[PDB]
Each structure stands twice: as C-alpha cells, then as structure tokens.
Amino acid sequence: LQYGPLAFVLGERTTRKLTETSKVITVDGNICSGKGRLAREIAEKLGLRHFPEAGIHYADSTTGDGKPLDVQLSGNCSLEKFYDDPKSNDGNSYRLQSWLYASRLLQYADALEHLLSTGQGVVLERSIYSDFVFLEAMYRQGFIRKQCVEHYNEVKKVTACEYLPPHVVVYVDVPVPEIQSRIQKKGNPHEMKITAAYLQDIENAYKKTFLPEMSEKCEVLQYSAREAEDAEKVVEDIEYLKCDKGPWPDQDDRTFHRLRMLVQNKLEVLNYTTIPVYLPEITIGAHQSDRVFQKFTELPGRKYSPGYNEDVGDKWIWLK
Amino acid sequence: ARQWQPDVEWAEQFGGAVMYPTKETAHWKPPPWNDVDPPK
Amino acid sequence: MNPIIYTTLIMTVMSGTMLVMISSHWLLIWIGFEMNLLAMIPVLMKNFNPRATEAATKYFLTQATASMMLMMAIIINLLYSGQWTITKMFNPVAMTMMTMALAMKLGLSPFHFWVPEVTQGISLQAGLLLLTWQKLAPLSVLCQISQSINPNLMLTMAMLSILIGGWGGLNQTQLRKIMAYSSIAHMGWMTAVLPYNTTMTILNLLIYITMTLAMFMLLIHSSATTTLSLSHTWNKMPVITSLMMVTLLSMGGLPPLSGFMPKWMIIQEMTKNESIIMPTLMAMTALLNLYFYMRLAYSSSLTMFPSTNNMKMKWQFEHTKQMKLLPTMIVLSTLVLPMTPALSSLN
Amino acid sequence: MLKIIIPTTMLLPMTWMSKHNMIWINATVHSLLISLISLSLLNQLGENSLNFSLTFFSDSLSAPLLVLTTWLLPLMLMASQSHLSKETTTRKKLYITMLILLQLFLIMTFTATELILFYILFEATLVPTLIIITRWGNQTERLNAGLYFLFYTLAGSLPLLVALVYIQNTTGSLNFLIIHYWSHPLSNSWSNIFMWLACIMAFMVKMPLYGLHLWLPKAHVEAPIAGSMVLAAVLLKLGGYGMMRITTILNPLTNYMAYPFLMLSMWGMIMTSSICLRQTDLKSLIAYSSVSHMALVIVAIMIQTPWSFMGATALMIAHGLTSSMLFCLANTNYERVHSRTMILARGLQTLLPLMATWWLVASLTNLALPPSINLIGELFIITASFSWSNITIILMGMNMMITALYSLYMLITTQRGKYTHHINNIKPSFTRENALMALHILPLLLLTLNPKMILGPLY
Amino acid sequence: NVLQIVRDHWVHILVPVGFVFGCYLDRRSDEKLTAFRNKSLLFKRELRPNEEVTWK
Amino acid sequence: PHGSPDWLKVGLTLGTSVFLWIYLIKQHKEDVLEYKRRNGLE
Amino acid sequence: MPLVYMNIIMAFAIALAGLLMYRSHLMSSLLCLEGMMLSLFIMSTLIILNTHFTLANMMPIILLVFAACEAALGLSLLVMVSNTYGTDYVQNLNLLQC
Amino acid sequence: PPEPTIRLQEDPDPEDENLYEKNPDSHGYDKDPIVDLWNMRVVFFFGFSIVLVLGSTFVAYLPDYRMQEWARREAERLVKYREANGLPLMESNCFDPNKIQLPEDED
Amino acid sequence: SSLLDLIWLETILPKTTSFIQMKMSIMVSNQKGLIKLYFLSFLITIMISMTLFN
Numbered sequence A: 001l002q003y004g005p006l007a008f009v010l011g012e013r014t015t016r017k018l019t020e021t022s023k024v025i026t027v028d029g030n031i032c033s034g035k036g037r038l039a040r041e042i043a044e045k046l047g048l049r050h051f052p053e054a055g056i057h058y059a060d061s062t063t064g065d066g067k068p069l070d071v072q073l074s075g076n077c078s079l080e081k082f083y084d085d086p087k088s089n090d091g092n093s094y095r096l097q098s099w100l101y102a103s104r105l106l107q108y109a110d111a112l113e114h115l116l117s118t119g120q121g122v123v124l125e126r127s128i129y130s131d132f133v134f135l136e137a138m139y140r141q142g143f144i145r146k147q148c149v150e151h152y153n154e155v156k157k158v159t160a161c162e163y164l165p166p167h168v169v170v171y172v173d174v175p176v177p178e179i180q181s182r183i184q185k186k187g188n189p190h191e192m193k194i195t196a197a198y199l200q201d202i203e204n205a206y207k208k209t210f211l212p213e214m215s216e217k218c219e220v221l222q223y224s225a226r227e228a229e230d231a232e233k234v235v236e237d238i239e240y241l242k243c244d245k246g247p248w249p250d251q252d253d254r255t256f257h258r259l260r261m262l263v264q265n266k267l268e269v270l271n272y273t274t275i276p277v278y279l280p281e282i283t284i285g286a287h288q289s290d291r292v293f294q295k296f297t298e299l300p301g302r303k304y305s306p307g308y309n310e311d312v313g314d315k316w317i318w319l320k
Numbered sequence B: 001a002r003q004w005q006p007d008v009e010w011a012e013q014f015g016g017a018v019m020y021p022t023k024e025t026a027h028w029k030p031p032p033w034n035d036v037d038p039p040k
Numbered sequence C: 001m002n003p004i005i006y007t008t009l010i011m012t013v014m015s016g017t018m019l020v021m022i023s024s025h026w027l028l029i030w031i032g033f034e035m036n037l038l039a040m041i042p043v044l045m046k047n048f049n050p051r052a053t054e055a056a057t058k059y060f061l062t063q064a065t066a067s068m069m070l071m072m073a074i075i076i077n078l079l080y081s082g083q084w085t086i087t088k089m090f091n092p093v094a095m096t097m098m099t100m101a102l103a104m105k106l107g108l109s110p111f112h113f114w115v116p117e118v119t120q121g122i123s124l125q126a127g128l129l130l131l132t133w134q135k136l137a138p139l140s141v142l143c144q145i146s147q148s149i150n151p152n153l154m155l156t157m158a159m160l161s162i163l164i165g166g167w168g169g170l171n172q173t174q175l176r177k178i179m180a181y182s183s184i185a186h187m188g189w190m191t192a193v194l195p196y197n198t199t200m201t202i203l204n205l206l207i208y209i210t211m212t213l214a215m216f217m218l219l220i221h222s223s224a225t226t227t228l229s230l231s232h233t234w235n236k237m238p239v240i241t242s243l244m245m246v247t248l249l250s251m252g253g254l255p256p257l258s259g260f261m262p263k264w265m266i267i268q269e270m271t272k273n274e275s276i277i278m279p280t281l282m283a284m285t286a287l288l289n290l291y292f293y294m295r296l297a298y299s300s301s302l303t304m305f306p307s308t309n310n311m312k313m314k315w316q317f318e319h320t321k322q323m324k325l326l327p328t329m330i331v332l333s334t335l336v337l338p339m340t341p342a343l344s345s346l347n
Numbered sequence D: 001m002l003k004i005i006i007p008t009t010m011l012l013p014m015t016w017m018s019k020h021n022m023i024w025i026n027a028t029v030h031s032l033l034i035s036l037i038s039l040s041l042l043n044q045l046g047e048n049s050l051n052f053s054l055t056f057f058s059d060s061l062s063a064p065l066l067v068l069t070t071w072l073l074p075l076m077l078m079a080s081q082s083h084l085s086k087e088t089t090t091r092k093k094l095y096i097t098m099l100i101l102l103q104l105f106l107i108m109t110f111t112a113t114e115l116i117l118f119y120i121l122f123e124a125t126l127v128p129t130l131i132i133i134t135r136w137g138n139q140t141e142r143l144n145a146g147l148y149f150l151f152y153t154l155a156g157s158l159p160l161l162v163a164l165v166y167i168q169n170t171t172g173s174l175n176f177l178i179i180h181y182w183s184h185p186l187s188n189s190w191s192n193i194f195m196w197l198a199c200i201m202a203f204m205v206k207m208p209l210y211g212l213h214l215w216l217p218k219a220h221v222e223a224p225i226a227g228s229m230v231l232a233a234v235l236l237k238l239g240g241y242g243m244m245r246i247t248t249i250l251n252p253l254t255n256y257m258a259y260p261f262l263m264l265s266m267w268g269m270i271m272t273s274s275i276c277l278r279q280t281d282l283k284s285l286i287a288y289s290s291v292s293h294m295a296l297v298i299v300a301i302m303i304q305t306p307w308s309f310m311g312a313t314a315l316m317i318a319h320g321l322t323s324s325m326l327f328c329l330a331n332t333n334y335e336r337v338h339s340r341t342m343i344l345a346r347g348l349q350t351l352l353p354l355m356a357t358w359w360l361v362a363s364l365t366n367l368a369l370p371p372s373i374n375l376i377g378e379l380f381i382i383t384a385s386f387s388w389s390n391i392t393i394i395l396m397g398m399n400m401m402i403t404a405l406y407s408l409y410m411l412i413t414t415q416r417g418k419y420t421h422h423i424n425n426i427k428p429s430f431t432r433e434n435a436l437m438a439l440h441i442l443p444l445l446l447l448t449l450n451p452k453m454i455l456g457p458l459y
Numbered sequence E: 001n002v003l004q005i006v007r008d009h010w011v012h013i014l015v016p017v018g019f020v021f022g023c024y025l026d027r028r029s030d031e032k033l034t035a036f037r038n039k040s041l042l043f044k045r046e047l048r049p050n051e052e053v054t055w056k
Numbered sequence F: 001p002h003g004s005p006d007w008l009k010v011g012l013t014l015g016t017s018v019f020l021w022i023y024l025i026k027q028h029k030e031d032v033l034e035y036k037r038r039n040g041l042e
Numbered sequence G: 001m002p003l004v005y006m007n008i009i010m011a012f013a014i015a016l017a018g019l020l021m022y023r024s025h026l027m028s029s030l031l032c033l034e035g036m037m038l039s040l041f042i043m044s045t046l047i048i049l050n051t052h053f054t055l056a057n058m059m060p061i062i063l064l065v066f067a068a069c070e071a072a073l074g075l076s077l078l079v080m081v082s083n084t085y086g087t088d089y090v091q092n093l094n095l096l097q098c
Numbered sequence H: 001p002p003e004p005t006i007r008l009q010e011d012p013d014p015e016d017e018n019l020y021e022k023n024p025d026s027h028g029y030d031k032d033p034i035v036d037l038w039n040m041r042v043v044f045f046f047g048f049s050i051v052l053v054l055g056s057t058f059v060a061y062l063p064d065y066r067m068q069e070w071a072r073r074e075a076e077r078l079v080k081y082r083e084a085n086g087l088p089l090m091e092s093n094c095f096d097p098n099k100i101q102l103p104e105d106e107d
Numbered sequence I: 001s002s003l004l005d006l007i008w009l010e011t012i013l014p015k016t017t018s019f020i021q022m023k024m025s026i027m028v029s030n031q032k033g034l035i036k037l038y039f040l041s042f043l044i045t046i047m048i049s050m051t052l053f054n
Ligand SMILES: CCCCCCCCCCCCCCCCC[C@@H](O)O[C@H](CO[C@H](O)CCCCCCCCCCCCCCC)COP(=O)(O)OCC[N+](C)(C)C
Pocket: C202, C203, C206, C207, C210, C332, C333, C336, C339, C340, C341, C342, C343, C344, C345, C346, C347
C-alpha cells in the first residue's frame, strides 16, 4: 500500500512525525572548500542523514542498480571538458549546468520525501538554491550566452516556486588566495586550470545575492575557515536559533500531503526540466535522440519495468 | 541517404500561442509553462 | 484540497446529475442543476491560480444565466399550463427559452465562447470532468422534451456549433482548446439528431465520452498541454504517442474505427426523414476537425521532433500513478465498429 | 472466401512472434503461399457468380484483382527489404503489419457483396496507406502529400455514403445481386443528376480523373517503394471496380451525364502524355503515365459497352503490373544514386546490362507492344470508342504516339549515352532486384497466353 | 534437435492451420443456405437409392 | 521495485475469472432449458 | 394574460439585458442576476397564489434559498478576482481567450 | 557573434554500407550470409518453382466452367435441327409474342 | 505542366479551400477574451431567435 489519498484519509498524517528535529540543513561554500566535512559532521552529531553533493551520475544511483551509466546515456557532458576548455564550441558548459541543476532538484526531492516519510532530518550541500551562482560565474566570465541564463532562470523559477527553502543555510567563507592554494595542493590536473577570476566571480555572487536573499526568510551561518573545524559550535548555534519566519511554521497537514504527492512521482518533479525551447546547447535532434534512446533501452535492466526483466533475474514474470 | 525529420526551425511553427498568428496577434505570448501567473 | 472534501464534492456533482435525470418535476430538475453548478466550482479551482479563478467565474456566470433562463421558461410554461411534469411544454416562447438555456448549459453555438476559455483555464482532470460529465444532464433534459423543440432552431444551432468547432480547431496550439472545440463540434453533431431519434444522440454521446476520456487520460499520462510538449513524448513513451495517434484517427470518423459509428448512423437516420443536404454539410465540415486531428498526429507520433538533453533522466523513471480503465477506453474507442447493431439496446 | 481471409489475418501473429532476423523470410513465403491459394478463384464460370455466403461473393471482375492484390505483397516485401535494413525490429514489424492490413482490407473490399461494407473497407484502405506514406517517407513533403492523398479521396466519397444510405431508404437493399436484379431507370431530374454526381465523383477522384489528379504525383513521389507499388497497382483500380459495380443503377442518365467526364479524360490523356515528355523526375513521369492510362480506363467505363468493360479490366491488370515494375526499377536506380533525377544517372547499360534489359522490357510493355495484354485493353477500348464516335480515334491515336515517345525517352535518357563520370558507387545489381524484376514481368507474358482470365464477366 | 526447433518453428504452422480453419468455416456457412437443396426448378433430381443429399 | 508476486491478488483474480465463467455457463444452460420449456421443444 | 404579468416579464427582460450589457463592475452583473431572480420569485408567487395551488407554495421559498446560495458563491468568486487584481473591472478577465 | 552556428546536436549522416564489401556472393537480402542465402533459396523456390509453374499449369488445365464447348454442341445441334427442317435459322424474337400482353391503345 | 497542372488546377480546388478555411479560422479564433462581447452577442442572438422562430 503506497502512500496516497486513501493513506492520508485513514492513518497517514505526516505532521505528527515532525519532532522539531527535521530542520533541513544545507551546507554550502566555494569550490573544494571544507563544507563537505562540515556537513558530514553536522549530520553525524545531529543524528540526521547526510546526502552527498549531487554529481553527473547521481540519478543513475537512484534507479535500478547504483552503478553509473555511460556519459553518453546519462548527462552527455563532462566536468573535465568544462575545466579544460570552458568556451567549448559544442556548449558543454551549459549542458553541464542544466544537468547538475536537474540532478540537484531530484536530490532535493529525494531528501524531502525521506524527511516527510520518516520524520528524520537531512543534511545537504548546494541545493537548487545557490546553484545559480555557478551560472553567474559562467556568464560573467563569458563562458555561456544570455539566452542560456534566461533559460536557467525560467526553469529555476518554474521548478522552485513550489518547494520549501531549507530552515538553515550554512556558508563556509574561504578567501580566494587560500582556496587557490588548496586547489594547487589537491593536485587534480583539471582543477589547476581554474582561473582566479572564476573563483572571485563565484564568491562575489554567493555573498552578494545568496546571503541577503536567504537572510530575510531563513537563518544564516557565515563561518570562516578557521572557525569551521569546530563542529560543536556549529551544532550549538543550530540549536540556539529558532525558526519562526519561514513558511515551515506556517505549514499545515493538507499542504504537507500535497508536498508528499509532489516529492514522489519523480516524473512530475522533472516535468518542467525539459520545456520545449530550443537552445543549441541543450536541444538534440531526432536522429541522435532516437539512437541514444535505443542504446539506453538495450541496457540489461532498462527494457521493461524494474520488476519485469528476465535477464537481470526476475522470476515468476507471468504472474506479476 | 537519411530520412528527413523535423528540426528546430520546423518545430518553431507550433511554438506560438496560435497557428499562423496575425499582425494584431503577433505580440501575443503563449501561456506560462506552469499555469501560474506572476502576482505583479 | 482534503481528499474527503474532494470526494464529497464529486459525489455532490454526481448526485445533482442523477437528481436531474431521475426527477419528473421541473423544480427538482432546476435544483439538480443548481447542486451541480454549486459543487462544480471548487473542482475547477482545485489548483489555485488566477487562471482557474477566471475560468471558474466565467463558468459560474454562464451557468447562472442559463439556470435563470431555464427557471423563467419553467415559470412561463406553468403560467400557460398549470403543469410541473416534464412533458410537452405547451408554449412556443417557453420552449425557445428552455432550448436557449439548455444550449448555453451544453455550450452550443452561439453560446460556445465560454467552453474554450474555461477548458484552457482549468487543469486536465477538471477539463476531463467538464467535457464528460457536464453533458449528461442537459442532454437528458433535451431528450425528455424532444417532441417539443422547434426543429429549425435546434438544427440551425447544431449546424452553427459544428461550423464553429471545425473552424476554431484550426487555429489552436494548446491542446485543451483543441479538446474544447472538439467537444463543441460533437455537441453540434449530437443535437442535430434529437428531433429524429434520441437513441442516436445517446449512442453518439457514449462514443464521444469514451473517446474524450481516452484522450484526456493519454494527455494526463504524458504531461503535455501544448503541441511541442506533446511532440517531446516520442522520446520517452512511443507507445503512448502511437495510441494517441490511433485515438485521434478514431475521433475524426475514419473507418473502421469507432468514431465512424455515430456519424454514419446519424446520417442514415437523417436520411430516413428526407433530409439530405444537412448531413452532407456536416460531413464536409467535420473534414476540418479531421484536418486538425491530422496536424496534431503529424506533430505527435508520425514524425520525430527534436528533444532535450534532460529527457535522458526521464528515461530512468517510471510512471508511478497508473490509471485504470485506460486500455479499456482505448479499445472501446477504436475497435467497436463490428458491434454496431448493439445500439438497438436503446443505450 | 474465408480460406483466403483467415491466412491473411494469421500473417499478423506470425510476423509479431517471429525472430528479429527471420521476419522477411516468413512473410514472403507465407504471402506467396496465400497467393497460390488465391489462384483458385481464377476458375470463374459463365453463370452468375461464386456466391460463397451472404457477405462475400466472387466474380470474374473481382477474381483477377484479388489475385493481383495477393501477388503484390511478396513483391512489396522484397522491395522494402533493402531500405528497412537499419530499422528497429518493432518498426519493421509495424511496417509489415501495415502491409498485411492493407492487403486484408483490399481482399475484403474486392468481394464485398453489400455496398456499405464495400464503402467501409474502401475507406479503411486509406489509413494504412496514409501511415506508410507519412511515416516511412524520405522527403519533407510527404506529410503534405499524405494530407492531399487523404482529403481529395474523402472529399470525393463523403457524399457517396449519403447517396448509398438514401438508396437503401428507397430501394430497400444494397446487396449487389438484389440491386442488379431490381434495377430501375433514373428519370431525368435535378435530384437524379445530383445522385449520379454523388455516386460517380467518389470513384472519379481516386482513379484519378484529370483535374482531380493533383494528389497522385505527390503521393507516388513522396511515398516509399512499397507505397508506390500499392498505390499504382491496386489502389488505383478501386475507382474502376466501384464504377463498374455502381453504373448498374445510373442508366439511362449516364448516356448524357458522361459528356464532361469523357471530354476531361480524352483531353487529360493527351495533357498528361505531353507532361511526361518534359519531366525532371522519374517517379513523376511514371505517375503521370498512370494518370493517362487511368483516364483511358475512365473513358472505357463511361462508354459502357461489353468491349469497353473487357478492355478496361485487361488494361487495369496490365497497367498495375507495368507500373509496379517501373516503380521498382526507378527505386533500384534511386537506391544507388540517392537523387531521383533522370539526367544525373546516364549510360547505365554499360554498367548494368541485365537492368538495362529489364528497363527495355518494362518500357516495351508500357509502350503497349503486341501481343501484350496492355495492347489488348488498348485496342478494345479504342474500338469501343470508335463505335461510340468515329472521331475519338484521332485523340486516341495521338495518345498512343506520345506514349511511345516518352517511354523510349525514359529508356534513352537513363540507359543510353555516356555514363556520369563522378558516380562511382554503382554496385552490381543484387539477386533480389533481378528476382523482383522477373516476378514482375513473367506473369504479364504468361497472361498474354490466356487473355480470358482478365477480360471480365462480359467475355 | 527436438523441443528446440519447436520453440523457434511453431510460428510456421500458424498460417497453414488457419487456412484449413477457413475451409472449415466455409463449409459451416454452406449449411445455412441449404434451404433450396434439390428444390431448384432446374436441377430438381430424384435421389439415388443410397443418396441422402445432392451436395454438401 | 523489489516485490514478490502477490499471491493474494493472483488468487483473487483467478477465483473471479473461474466464478464468472461458471456463472456464465450455468446461466446459459438455464436459459436454454427455459427457452425449450417455454416453446415446447424438449 | 393580465398586464401585471407583462410588467414582470418586462422587468425580467430588462434585468437580463442589463446583465448581458457588461459595461463594467461585475458587482453590477451580480446585482442584475439578483434582480432577475427577484422578478422570477414575484412572478412565481403571483402565479401560484392566483390559481390556489396550495402545495406549490413551497416552490418560491426554496427557489429563493437556492438562488441566494448562488449569490453568495458569486460574491466569493468576485472577491477572489479582486484579490488578484485589486479591483473588479470586467476587462481584467482577459487572460483566457478563444 | 560567438554563436556556434550549429542549430542543434546532430549525428553526422552515415555513409551507405556496401553489402558486397563484407560478403561476396551476397544475394542482397540480408547482412547475415546464412539467413541471406536461405532467403534467396525460399524466395526462388516459392516464387518461380512453386507459384509460377504449378499455378500456371493449374490455370491452364482449369475445368471448362464457362460452358464454351457446351455452347458449341448446343449451337451445332440447333443449326442441324433448323437446317434439316427448313426453319429460318435464327429467330428475331427472343420471347414468343403469344406470351406477351401488349397494352391496347386504340388511339 | 506549369500553367495548368502546377498553377490553376492547384489554385482552384485545394488552395482556395485552404485560404477560405484559414480566413474563417482566423475570424473565429480572433477573440480577445472579453466576456463583454460574448454576452453582447448572447443578447443579440436571444433577441433574433424570438423574432425569427416565432
Ligand atoms: C464505446 C461504446 C459504448 C460503451 C458503453 C459503456 C459500457 C459499460 C457499461 C456497463 C453497463 C451499462 C448499464 C448497466 C446495466 C444495468 C442497467 C440497465 O438496467 O439499465 C437499462 C438501460 O439500458 C442500458 O442503457 C443498456 C446498456 C448497453 C450499453 C452499450 C450499447 C452500445 C452499442 C454500440 C457500441 C458497441 C458496444 C460494445 C461493447 C461496449 C434500463 O433502461 P431504461 O431505464 O428502461 O430506459 C432508459 C433509456 N431511454 C430513456 C433511452 C429509454
């Protein structure tokens, strides 16, 4: 018996599972910062569940087996090509940006459905909110066009006009020279090609737009690099602040039911991610799309529904 | 050697609010993707 | 809204329709219409936005005016003959006003203007309800007084409705407006055979209801409200696009599909009454409905439109909420021509 | 008649249950077996008919058309085997399903004891052909072509349905036997004039008649090879079969209502034969030749004499075979050139001699060389028209000359001369193409031995 | 090999069997119309001593 | 996802089909018996 | 048919024409609807009382009740429209078009 | 104008695959040599060997259901009868006028 | 070829029909969405029906 209107009618009221502990938290910062360790420690200390940052093949892990698929069958883009030649002729940068945004939207939907179905809180990295800063970094540097950012704004507004922003936003503030030094120490050959202007643009956008906009409706934790390793202070400040300005206190059982309808049925979550406006970076013609779809359908566990694949090992097919 | 299939230029014929818009109706815009209008 | 409230409102709509159909008193029929209108408004506004509120207020205004005209027709009929039973109306003026009220309730031309706007404003499920269940009551009332209607007024209104539906379906890109104009055309087809045989009207209503239920179910299955969003569907569920193309062919009246059954039958009945010109004009006019069905079929399945990069992710997820009776609706809407003589059951 | 309808229906589950690399073999073998079974219907009798049941009956006009329809499908499968090689198994099965459905509809249409069932199947044939034209068509114009191929036809036949039911409201039945036995003359009245027009214009448009033929070049050029085969060979003869069946109730009005159509056909044969002389496309040339031959058949049907009917039947059969073979040859050239232009590929007898021989035989058959059945129908219609009026021969004679001209022109431009230097992808002709050509051409020369099998019920 | 070709060649009998089925159906259709058997004014014949029906 | 064949639903479906078939056969036999009785065939 | 019934029908027709005019101010449209209902109520009451059809005395009050319910419904819709636009002019209802 | 001038992401048009290059003795039915050879065999056997020859012989030896020789013998005996007894061969009237009731006019 | 087949025979039947249907569709579907005009037309048709059909 999957959750539905009948479940809500009979027993399933999800406002009872909330115990003030849910408090969805996003830990976000600049590239290759300490935000990941902070998020993991916050999840460990507060007893929440940590969701790793969404990548190119995040959606591949949630469907069927967790093994990622081929780049052509899932994403059609690579971060390494973006680092090597950000001004690529084939529009790899914005294809990467849109795929990452859609993956983050799916991850946010998964975190929300877990929170609403179990009552346990979650910890996230950069959500659908604060993703746009990378878009800004791609535009100010001249890597992508203006029609691209208009597309991203349209898709972002349409998708995110219906989700609840996180209770607490935690920002790990790291200076650009310091993060450049850490990038140099990391040794990833593609990441040493990042310019100082890119990081400066990303940081400025994060401080200028993300911090005040989330200030008036949420609680903000602007923490420095040295004071971020002490996760006990972070968790104490999480407990100390109280949420009474966001829409979460204004929330009710019926709209929780509507949200729990939205978070499941992922096809409705990603419905507006494929709006029919034709930018050369994202649009794909009939022949290539047909070939890629046929190639995808030939995968061992993708021809039929998950429970109806003979080669995988599904038995008693003719009675399911 | 390849079967012709519709491209972006052909597909944009149906992107308008109404087929073959007139000069009066040229400025008309299709409805929003979601059926929600800004509160302006 | 709350599932209990939604279920109660749906039950109220259906009970108002049933009260209209089973009542032998004009006041009870008016009460059923009032109940239906009262309970229909929140259904149109289930998803709150300016568009739904606009559609709901337009619908309320139109239906309230139609109900007031119907009540005045009842009052005049009572004045000129102290009878409340639904029978011979005994008064031409009351008959004309009743016909106009019922046509405005149905959406027949020239009272067709509200249908496309209300259908465009409301969602797909609301449009399904509005175009399927909202025709049972006015058509039943019209069939009960079939011997009373002036044939000239009914036939000219039906011809106007068919013409307007066929012409207006050509200019539409949004699918909901297309379905609204198709509903207008089918209403015109049904109301043209009331003076001759109500069994043909009921058969056409059943076939149209099946076809439009199948079409709205298919449009719900693949979240498409415009032509291009429908064209994007082939890259994920080609079976849905093929079934929708077959259904669209059926709605156009192409044999040996189910949609040919009503028109043919209706035409044959209208040939029994020495009427030849009018079925010919209706056929040539329904050619326009067929044309825009063909254009939608070209844009949907018979060609492959360009896709987007994000659709790959949609490949990995399955349609969770699976609706029932859809295969049955498609089968009845496509392959019931050999069972035509079954219309003798006086459905 | 069910002994042939049932195997055609069972062709569908066999195709849908077959292996991904064995559908063509099964389809071809079982289609040939069905054609062999359908050869039994050719044993007609001078008496009334082969009235199998209340729903199906066979005559010596329906029997040759049924045999040709059954024989066409294997040829279409062999022709389509090539360009559907890179096609997915499901879509290939869908294509074969469309072909099988079209054959089933045509088979049920050609027996059709009752007229309303005949009309229903007549219009049921429109859907698979439209799907084939609009889906598996190479060029961008196919959609428009499909639209034309639809609407013209429907515009012709929507009045007919009304006329049909009107007849059943007055006569009381639409069974062809009762219609023939209870025939009554049509008085000279405006209502009878419009009933005649409604009955005739339905089949005039699909034949097609000159002035209503604009859909045909588009439909034949834009359709795939199998679509061109089925349109030129069988789907054109539906109008002639319908006219010969329905003219039993239009007398004596036709005696003066056929003048506009006789004039239109007798001038359109010349117009289309002259159009064929200056054409930059092979498929358009073949389509216009088909229009000319069908205009001659229309003239024959409008004359309404026994020799006219015999010539019309023979010409329909011969033209179907010849046009199918010509379209196959044009497609074989196109599959190597990928241009569909007469003057781009030249001097092909130096590179493909057997294909040049096939081209010569097809051109000679189109040129109406005796003692082929083409010329049998030609001479029968010509003598019947001469009896109708001694002046018609003039026009007819002109047509004949012009015919030969463009035929040899099509043979000379494409085969003779110097080869195109910059075309080096002319591979030797496969065994499949040569077998297709032989299976097209041998039945013609075997039928010329026994003409009475295709001369109709008035032999 | 038995039990293996049948898994691959069971479709081959599909068309032929239907054929004989159709033949059977044709015979069934014939029985309904026997309303004038040996009653024709042209082929009216006296039955043979060991004959029951002129045609089947 | 990971779901075993629901024996309850399978049993319900099979039982419904068998019951409907048996009821149809019984109804047909009763109808033919009543028809023969009313028209005096057997 | 006496002149009082003619006057009532004229009033109903005038109210219907005023409703169908739509100069502006949907509130006036609801007012015209209520005037039509009032004319209907008066005419029905006069007809029922004149003929001494006792059991029909139930009909008018019921009518009024139902109609008044619809009135409330309309008002609610109007209010919501205003809350979207700040005003109730008819021309603001032009987003949905044929 | 930094636009890529590429309207969309498209596969290049593939070149046609020659059947002879990978398979001499192709017969041009399929890219699988065994399936292609058996397709050729069955097509030839069922078209030329089975239908073309046996069907032609079946049509040639069809029984005379058209009543041509029957009409020959009937006409022969009729001509013999009419010549022997001096009858005027063919009669201009199909039906005997004694069985036709013409409508009296008296105009 | 050009004057008759490709121009006039194309202009008479199909192109004229397409033009007429397109113009009628444009006229029918060119509605600004104002209920003012809708109910003015409703008043006009209500007025015309009583006079014409009685
Ligand atoms: C798409 C094709 C149509 C499908 C229609 C839906 C099929 C499922 C419906 C389930 C059963 C329907 C009715 C339930 C049976 C019991 C109710 C029955 O007792 O009511 C009778 C009502 O009879 C039913 O309507 C007959 C049901 C049969 C409907 C199917 C006819 C369709 C024929 C052509 C399409 C081919 C259909 C193929 C299979 C669906 C009593 O009639 P009555 O109250 O005294 O007279 C009222 C009607 N008047 C006013 C016109 C005189």
